[PDB]
């Protein structure tokens, strides 16, 4: 199952793609929001091929168009499919910083429309985007669904099983703890936390990430 979707509730699913790296499958997660006005994804996938497959899958499943994607940072698991999005008229939301870094990391440019705290609404689906500070990357954001207390952590947030922070060349490891604390402060009662990779959990993922960073 290279692309899978898993349900959190009626209109919120996790999408998960196995990228192929050195003969290893590597999952990446994002979210699929089924809204009265189309499907909204949080994050694309590793590359255009997978992004196209993801879009195909979700569109067929829900019989709805993907209209918007929120890009959580300017790396491949997240923004790999930006060309696919642009060539489909799928709006690719991001902070200005993510757009700037995208333009630098060799990618087409997302919208740069998100601020530190931004509210979006897609049909009846409310979405908050939050830049908690630097961590995994300078630009990493998280996404929250206030109606459902579901948090999409991206690569800022590690799964329970993770013992390793990943590539930290471009990480702000010291600042990452504070950014996670900012997320823990902001989001008090959380029903689900989606890590960038790995199993969905709850607030314990945030605490576990903090623990890794200690
Ligand atoms: Zn990354
Ligand atoms: Zn990642």
CA pseudo-torsion sign 154, 160, 162, 165: positive
In sequence order, the 6+-apart residues with CB closer than 8 A to the CB of 210 are 177, 180, 181, 184
Q: Which CATH architecture has domain 1-214?
A: 4-Layer Sandwich (3.60)
Half-sphere exposure of 138 (CA within 13 A, CB side): 10
Is 208 assigned a catalytic role?
A: no
How many CB atoms are located within 10 Å of the residue 16 CB? 22
Q: Which ligand gives the minimal distance to the CA of 136?
A: 1
170, burial (CB in 10 Å: exposed 0-12, middle 13-18, buried 19+)? middle
Task: Dump the DSSP string for the chain.
Answer: --EEEEEEETTEEEEEEEEEETTEEEEEEEEEEEETTEEEEE---SSHHHHHHHHHHHHHHHT--EEEEE--SSSHHHHTTHHHHHTTT-EEE-BHHHHHHHHHTT-------B-SEEEEEETTEEEEEE---SSSSSS--EEEETTTTEEEEETTS--TT-------TT--HHHHHHHHHHHHHH--S-SEEEESSS--B-THHHHHHHHHH-
**Torsions phi, psi for 155 (to 5 deg):** -80, 0
Do the beta carbons of residue 141 and residue 73 sit within 8 Å? yes
User: Rounded to whole angstroms, how far apart are CA atoms 70 and 22?
Assistant: 28
Which-ligand-closest: CA of 195?
A: 2
Residue 167: active-site member:
yes
87 CA → ligand 2 middle, Å: 24
Would the CA dihedral through 12, 44, 38, 64 be positive or negative?
negative
- CA gap 121, 127 in Å, rounded: 6
- d(CA 76, CA 96) in angstroms, rounded, equals 17
- Do residues 70 and 143 make contact, with C-beta atoms less than 8 angstroms apart? yes
Residue 163: other Cβ atoms inside 10 A: 7
Query: Is 34 in the active site?
Result: no
Domain ranges of the chain: 1-214
By the 8 A CB rule, do 41 and 66 touch?
yes
Cα angle 72, 187, 16 (rounded to 5 degrees) comes to: 40
With beta carbons less than 8 A apart as the criterion, state whether 133 and 123 touch.
Answer: no
CA–CA separation, 84 vs 55, rounded Å? 9
The residue among 157, 128, 130, 152 whose CA lies nearest residue 141 is 130
Rounded CA separation 89/104 (Å): 22
Q: How far is CA 145 from CA 8, 12, 39, 97, 184, in A?
A: 12, 9, 14, 22, 15
Ligand nearest to the CA of 153: 2
Q: Distance (Å, rounded) from C-alpha 74 to C-alpha 52?
A: 18
Residue 7 has a CB neighbour count (10 Å cut-off) of 11
Whether residue 150 contacts residue 192, with contact meaning beta carbons closer than 8 Å, is answered with yes
């Amino acid at each position: 199952g290279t692309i899978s979707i898993s349900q959190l509730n009626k209109n919120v699913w996790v999408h998960t793609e196995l990228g192929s790296f050195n003969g290893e499958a590597v999952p990446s997660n994002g979210l699929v929001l089924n809204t009265s006005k189309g499907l909204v994804l949080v994050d694309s996938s590793w590359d255009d091929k997978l992004t196209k497959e993801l879009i195909e899958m979700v569109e067929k499943k829900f019989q709805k168009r993907v209209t918007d994607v929120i890009i959580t940072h300017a790396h491949a698991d997240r923004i790999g499919g930006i060309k696919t999005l642009k060539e489909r008229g799928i709006k690719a939301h991001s902070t200005a910083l993510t757009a700037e870094l995208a333009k630098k990391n060799g990618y087409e440019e997302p919208l740069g429309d998100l601020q530190t705290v931004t509210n979006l609404k897609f049909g009846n689906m409310k979405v908050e985007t939050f830049y908690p500070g630097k961590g995994h990357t300078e630009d990493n954001i998280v996404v929250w669904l206030p109606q459902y207390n579901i948090l999409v952590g991206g690569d800022l947030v590690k799964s329970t099983s993770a013992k390793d922070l990943g590539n930290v060349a471009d990480a702000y490891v010291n600042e990452w703890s504070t950014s996670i604390e900012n997320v823990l402060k902001r989001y008090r009662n959380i029903n689900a936390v989606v890590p960038g990779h790995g199993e969905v959990g709850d607030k314990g993922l945030l605490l576990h990430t903090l623990d890794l960073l200690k």
